[PDB]
């Protein structure tokens, strides 16, 4: 029920709630999906990488 994620690409809020943009492993960008932060606890390493990147600039 969980899929391997390759990269977190973006962050946003929809109706007040935080979401991240997910690039899935073994899938091209056309399959990328905005997921609620609640969904993404098992890839918090990648989330962290993404948040480091935007902080870097």
């Amino acid at each position: 029920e969980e899929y391997v994620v390759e990269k977190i690409l973006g962050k946003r809020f929809v109706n007040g709630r935080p979401q991240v943009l997910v690039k899935w492993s073994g899938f091209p960008n056309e399959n990328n999906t905005w997921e609620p932060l609640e969904n993404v606890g098992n890839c918090m390493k990648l989330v962290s990488d993404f948040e480091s990147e935007v902080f870097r600039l």
């Binding site: 391997v4 390759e6 997921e35 993404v40």
Partner: peptide, 8 residues
């Protein structure tokens, strides 16, 4: 750790 997430 394997990096995974749910789809929704």
């Amino acid at each position: 750790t394997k990096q995974t997430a749910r789809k929704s």
